Design a protein around this nucleic acid. Structure first.
Ligand SMILES: [K+]
Ligand SMILES: [K+]
Ligand SMILES: [K+]
Ligand SMILES: [K+]
Ligand SMILES: [K+]
Ligand SMILES: [K+]
Ligand SMILES: [K+]
Ligand SMILES: [Mg+2]
Ligand SMILES: [Mg+2]
Ligand SMILES: [Mg+2]
Ligand SMILES: [Mg+2]
Ligand SMILES: [Mg+2]
Ligand SMILES: [Mg+2]
Ligand SMILES: [Mg+2]
Ligand SMILES: [Mg+2]
Ligand SMILES: [Mg+2]
Ligand SMILES: [Mg+2]
Ligand SMILES: [Mg+2]
Ligand SMILES: [Mg+2]
Ligand SMILES: [Mg+2]
Ligand SMILES: [Mg+2]
Ligand SMILES: [Mg+2]
Ligand SMILES: [Mg+2]
Ligand SMILES: [Mg+2]
Ligand SMILES: [Mg+2]
Ligand SMILES: [Mg+2]
Ligand SMILES: [Mg+2]
Ligand SMILES: [Mg+2]
Ligand SMILES: [Mg+2]
Ligand SMILES: [Mg+2]
Ligand SMILES: [Mg+2]
Ligand SMILES: [Mg+2]
Ligand SMILES: [Mg+2]
Ligand SMILES: [Mg+2]
Ligand SMILES: [Mg+2]
Ligand SMILES: [Mg+2]
Ligand SMILES: [Mg+2]
Ligand SMILES: [Mg+2]
Ligand SMILES: [Mg+2]
Ligand SMILES: [Mg+2]
Ligand SMILES: [Mg+2]
Ligand SMILES: [Mg+2]
Ligand SMILES: [Mg+2]
Ligand SMILES: [Mg+2]
Ligand SMILES: [Mg+2]
Ligand SMILES: [Mg+2]
Ligand SMILES: [Mg+2]
Ligand SMILES: [Mg+2]
Ligand SMILES: [Mg+2]
Ligand SMILES: [Mg+2]
Ligand SMILES: [Mg+2]
Ligand SMILES: [Mg+2]
Ligand SMILES: [Mg+2]
Ligand SMILES: [Mg+2]
Ligand SMILES: [Mg+2]
Ligand SMILES: [Mg+2]
Ligand SMILES: [Mg+2]
Ligand SMILES: [Mg+2]
Ligand SMILES: [Mg+2]
Ligand SMILES: [Mg+2]
Ligand SMILES: [Mg+2]
Ligand SMILES: [Mg+2]
Ligand SMILES: [Mg+2]
Ligand SMILES: [Mg+2]
Ligand SMILES: [Mg+2]
Ligand SMILES: [Mg+2]
Ligand SMILES: [Mg+2]
Ligand SMILES: [Mg+2]
Ligand SMILES: [Mg+2]
Ligand SMILES: [Mg+2]
Ligand SMILES: [Mg+2]
Ligand SMILES: [Mg+2]
Ligand SMILES: [Mg+2]
Ligand SMILES: [Mg+2]
Ligand SMILES: [Mg+2]
Ligand SMILES: [Zn+2]
Lengths: 235, 150, 208, 138
RNA sequence: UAGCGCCGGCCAACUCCGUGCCAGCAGCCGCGGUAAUACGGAGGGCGCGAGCGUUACCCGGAUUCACUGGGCGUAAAGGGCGUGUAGGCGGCCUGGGGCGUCCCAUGUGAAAGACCACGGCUCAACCGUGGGGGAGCGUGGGAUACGCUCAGGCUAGACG
RNA sequence: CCUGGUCCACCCGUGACGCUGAGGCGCGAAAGCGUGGGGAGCAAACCGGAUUAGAUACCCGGGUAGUCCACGCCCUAAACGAUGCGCGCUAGGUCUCUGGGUCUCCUGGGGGCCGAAGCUAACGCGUUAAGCGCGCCGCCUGGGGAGUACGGCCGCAAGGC
């Protein structure tokens, strides 16, 4: 909540090409063939975005974090592994929201196989199944790791790159689910309800924004949590 | 609570090695006659499953109609594909004057007197979609002044 | 022509109990009480989902066969109502109810509308004093429909007006039983009629 | 050159609103300005103002839109859903006072050019004069 | 006195027998070559009814000559290309005229018909009375935003 | 050598002198016609060899008109972007031709590809519009009959409109 001057590395955008003209309002200028985000409008939108986040958090709402850019995977896997908001990390399966019932059936199979490997029924029905179901539970935990926490449809979603995760954005629009997103120059701002005009490539921007967001979430529900152990993931 | 009536039921066919294989498509309108309508198009290997699926899709796609004394507030003209729909309000005592598709759609919406005309393509699917978009493009004087507040 | 022939077959075909014989459509002998299916060899067979034209045509045929009016006069009355200002359906119903034979039936002078037609056609009915023998005569608000003084000694009128003791008449009608007369107070509203017919379906039928 | 400056302005407004622009510049003229007065008075635009481009005077029309909508296509509802020129060069349309159209059964406007100035449908009907049916907007 | 058409879909009304791409039906799609709701007959049904059908013709549906109200990349349809005559169309500002445009008053718009109201033949058809209308054109007066014209000015089009 | 078109920079000059365009007039690939010339290669017709059931073809060996030039005719076409001309408006990215400039790049004109909004029946089009508009010309109104018949105009004829 004090990220005014500590925003080191967020103003960096993508190149001159691969941009979206609809983002021109959130751009300050172009330095050395690279779009640089407007520093003022960044916090201008951050006010309203974080205010919506606090309102939805203190009401007890669930937010789905979505990240697949391979630069925010290890960060989302723990910033959402804090206060119990679910997440999707490896890839966004088509129909996680519109076909939410079938994916919940997949989650049922996940916890069923978890109950099988907890019961003494592991050894019966010989080793063929002990390998098949082992690999099946492996991949189910690989994909539905954070998604298993959703019992109903989420009240909002959080996206790291709305261009790379455009399918989740589209499904959220279809179901009238608010779309919080960390938008860059390559993204369409109209599809994002609450926009965060920052960098989606640099690890520091993602760590800063997501850490402060989860800190605001836990601050809305009381019991301020220690700083997130995602700094060591700078590497 | 919800009234349901099918527009048309057709049997389409694909070609497979050995012969043609059929698939049934059905249009279904659902309405409470209070100002809410819904249009759905379901496809299933059998007819009853297609009718039920079209009913589900019709309940999923709803349109709020701003009725004013059982008629429409202002004349509309909608081009869906090559099909054109022309809606025009009428005084009470007239009745719903329309083709089968728009008559069913507007009657299930709660309309009692209106003057319509289908133009261009008479295709029941495109005419149904044109009538749905027409009802979706309806505005009231309240909505008009709401837009022009400034 | 007046369709003259079997009547309760229409009670069956129309699917709704009609009253074309007066009595015996109230007694368990209407053949609609015991045979509600349409007539013919294929009456008991499973009916197919009728078309919209089927629904509108059957509704209009119900409304027409209720009064026993030919298609010519029926279409003429409908066009006449559509020319007038006001709701086409309610004005049409008020016109049909204004027919002299239907007024005779409503005032209890005859048990059925066809018996009322025979009573009018044979000069047993007077309007404001003058004898009128036209079932298609239109009654105006304020006209006194009376029984012919020379006919008040007939057996049928004695029976009919002997059964009308204690019975009530429509809100738009008054009845003097001792003098064997009545008055047409006003045109009846749609709420006043208990007809099992949707008039908008008939309007849509003639909209084609 | 422009064969119909008024229709050119109306088309500029149409194409600008269809992409949700902020404002649009139209080559200035007293007729266009008297039309934009009616536009701003009726509420189809936030307003207009005279500006200067490199050497020539123009009119900046500040467009007006509705609130951002939900679901797919969050683009807001257009305040000017439809704007069409009627009395074009080569086929000019003149109407008497009893021949003035009621646009969308009252919800729209019809801009008339009459001997008493540029008015709307209701304004000209109240004044009691007809003239050239410039355009219709609703 | 009750008759006439229809009963595969459009289109309201289904069975039996005969026939076997024969005999035939048919407004359009089409039906008949062994078990035809389509032919022929019967029973039954549907629609009208002193009428019911057929044919012809007109308008309609037909937005299918598109003023309202259509089109031309591949469905019918951009001329092989240019120069350019008549014609059609005409950037910004001021003024005069008032031809187009608009407004007021007035005359004309016979009667019958059409519309509305009341009334006369027992109703109706038919008829009478009264009322209301109305585009267009003539005249007098007025308005000048736009189109027009004349006079002047400007440089964003055009040319140099 | 003679000559047309066109683009950019300066903001210099005229002061609406503009757009389109029924007729008219001119241009108009190839083939074809006339007169004269030329004629290496190619090559309709044709002369043969093969192939084939036959081969008036494809394949092979020859070969005339023609292709070429001058002058004069002919007016056709898948004469094609199967998209008339002009102007204004409406996201961009990339490739390229050609100017100008503070020469990473910007700006202007032209040729391509991908694509916003939008359009379209779809394919697809998308600042080179098939989008949004305006002006003007041409043309369409089911298929066959038929681009035929008659008539007219044009042409030496073939034939064309
Ligand atoms: K459209
Ligand atoms: K025979
Ligand atoms: K038969
Ligand atoms: K007209
Ligand atoms: K020679
Ligand atoms: K052509
Ligand atoms: K250069
Ligand atoms: Mg609404
Ligand atoms: Mg179309
Ligand atoms: Mg059509
Ligand atoms: Mg009426
Ligand atoms: Mg009427
Ligand atoms: Mg006039
Ligand atoms: Mg009206
Ligand atoms: Mg009012
Ligand atoms: Mg049927
Ligand atoms: Mg027959
Ligand atoms: Mg015929
Ligand atoms: Mg046999
Ligand atoms: Mg048989
Ligand atoms: Mg038969
Ligand atoms: Mg019979
Ligand atoms: Mg006849
Ligand atoms: Mg016809
Ligand atoms: Mg027509
Ligand atoms: Mg029409
Ligand atoms: Mg025709
Ligand atoms: Mg037209
Ligand atoms: Mg067309
Ligand atoms: Mg073509
Ligand atoms: Mg061309
Ligand atoms: Mg001229
Ligand atoms: Mg000229
Ligand atoms: Mg001018
Ligand atoms: Mg002129
Ligand atoms: Mg003046
Ligand atoms: Mg004048
Ligand atoms: Mg007269
Ligand atoms: Mg008269
Ligand atoms: Mg009378
Ligand atoms: Mg008058
Ligand atoms: Mg005058
Ligand atoms: Mg003056
Ligand atoms: Mg001048
Ligand atoms: Mg120059
Ligand atoms: Mg100068
Ligand atoms: Mg000068
Ligand atoms: Mg030219
Ligand atoms: Mg020419
Ligand atoms: Mg040539
Ligand atoms: Mg040649
Ligand atoms: Mg030669
Ligand atoms: Mg020679
Ligand atoms: Mg050779
Ligand atoms: Mg050879
Ligand atoms: Mg040979
Ligand atoms: Mg052979
Ligand atoms: Mg041989
Ligand atoms: Mg020769
Ligand atoms: Mg080509
Ligand atoms: Mg071309
Ligand atoms: Mg072009
Ligand atoms: Mg370019
Ligand atoms: Mg493309
Ligand atoms: Mg699109
Ligand atoms: Mg596509
Ligand atoms: Mg263009
Ligand atoms: Mg023909
Ligand atoms: Mg031909
Ligand atoms: Mg032809
Ligand atoms: Mg030819
Ligand atoms: Mg000839
Ligand atoms: Mg000759
Ligand atoms: Mg020859
Ligand atoms: Mg020829
Ligand atoms: Zn009965």
């Amino acid at each position: 909540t004090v990220k005014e001057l500590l925003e080191a590395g967020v103003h960096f955008g993508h190149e001159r090409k691969r941009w979206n003209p609809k983002f021109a309002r959130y751009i300050y200028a172009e330095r050395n063939g690279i779009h640089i985000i407007d520093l003022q409008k960044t916090m201008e939108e951050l006010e309203r975005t974080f205010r919506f986040i606090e309102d939805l958090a203190m009401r007890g709402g669930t937010i789905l974090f979505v990240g697949t850019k391979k630069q925010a995977q290890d960060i989302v896997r723990m910033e959402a592994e804090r206060a119990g908001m679910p997440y999707v990390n490896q890839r966004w399966l088509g129909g996680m929201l519109t076909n939410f019932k079938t994916i919940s059936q997949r989650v049922h199979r996940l916890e069923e196989l978890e109950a099988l490997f907890a019961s003494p029924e592991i050894e019966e029905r010989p080793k063929k199944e002990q390998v098949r179901l082992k690999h099946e539970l492996e991949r189910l935990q690989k994909y539905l790791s954070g998604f298993r926490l959703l019992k109903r449809l989420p009240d909002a979603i959080f996206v790291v790159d709305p261009t790379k995760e455009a399918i989740a954005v589209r499904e959220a629009r279809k179901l009238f689910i608010p779309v919080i997103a960390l938008a860059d120059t390559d993204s369409d701002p109209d599809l994002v309800d609450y926009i965060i005009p920052g960098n989606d490539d640099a690890i520091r921007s993602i760590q800063l924004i997501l850490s402060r967001a989860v800190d605001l979430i836990i601050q809305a529900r009381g019991g301020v949590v220690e700083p997130s152990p995602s700094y060591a993931l700078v590497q | 609570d919800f009234e349901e009536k099918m527009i048309l039921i057709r049997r389409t066919a694909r070609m497979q090695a050995g012969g043609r294989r059929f698939r049934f498509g059905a249009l279904v309108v659902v309405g409470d006659r209070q100002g809410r309508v819904g249009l759905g198009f379901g496809k299933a290997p059998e007819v009853p499953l297609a009718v039920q699926k079209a009913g589900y899709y019709a309940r999923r796609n709803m349109v709020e109609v701003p009725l004013q004394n059982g008629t429409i507030p202002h004349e509309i003209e909608v081009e869906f594909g090559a099909s054109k729909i022309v809606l025009k309000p009428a005084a009470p005592g007239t009745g719903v004057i329309a083709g089968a598709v728009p008559r069913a759609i507007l009657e299930l919406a709660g309309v009692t007197d209106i003057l319509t005309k289908e133009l261009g393509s008479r295709n029941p699917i495109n005419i149904a979609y044109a009538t749905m978009e027409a009802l979706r493009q309806l505005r009231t004087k309240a909505d008009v002044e709401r837009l022009r507040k400034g | 022509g007046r369709y003259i022939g079997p009547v309760c077959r229409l009670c069956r075909r129309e699917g709704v109990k009609l009253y074309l014989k007066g009595e015996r459509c109230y007694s368990p002998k209407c053949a609609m009480e015991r045979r509600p299916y349409p007539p013919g060899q294929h009456g008991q067979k499973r009916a197919r989902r009728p078309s919209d034209y089927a629904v509108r045509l059957r509704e209009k045929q119900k409304l027409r066969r209720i009064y026993g009016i030919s298609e010519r006069q029926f279409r003429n009355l409908f066009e006449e109502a559509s020319k007038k200002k006001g709701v086409t359906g309610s004005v049409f119903l008020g016109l049909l109810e204004s027919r002299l034979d239907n007024v005779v039936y409503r005032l209890g002078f005859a048990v059925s509308r066809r018996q009322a037609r025979q009573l009018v056609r044979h000069g047993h009915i007077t309007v404001n004093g003058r004898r009128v023998d036209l079932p298609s005569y239109r009654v105006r608000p304020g006209d006194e429909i009376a029984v012919a003084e020379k006919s008040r000694n007939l057996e049928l009128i004695r029976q009919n007006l002997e059964a009308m003791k204690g019975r009530k008449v429509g809100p738009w009608l008054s009845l003097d039983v001792e003098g064997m007369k009545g008055k047409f107070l006003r045109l009846p509203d749609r709420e006043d009629l208990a007809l099992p017919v949707n008039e908008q379906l008939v309007i849509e039928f003639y909209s084609r | 050159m422009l064969t119909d400056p008024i229709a050119d302005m109306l088309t500029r407004i149409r194409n600008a609103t269809r992409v949700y622009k902020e404002s649009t510049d139209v080559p200035a003229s007293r007729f266009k300005e008297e039309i934009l007065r009616i536009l701003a008075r009726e509420g189809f635009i936030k307003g207009y103002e005279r500006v200067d481009v490199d050497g020539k005077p123009y009119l900046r029309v500040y467009l007006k839109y509705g609130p951002r909508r939900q679901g797919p296509d969050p683009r807001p509802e257009q305040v000017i859903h439809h704007i069409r020129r009627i009395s074009k060069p080569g086929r000019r349309v003149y109407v008497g006072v009893k021949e003035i159209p009621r646009v969308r059964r009252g919800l729209g406007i019809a801009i008339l050019s009459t001997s008493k100035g540029v008015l709307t449908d209701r304004e000209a009907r109240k004044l009691g004069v007809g003239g050239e049916l410039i355009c219709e907007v609703w």
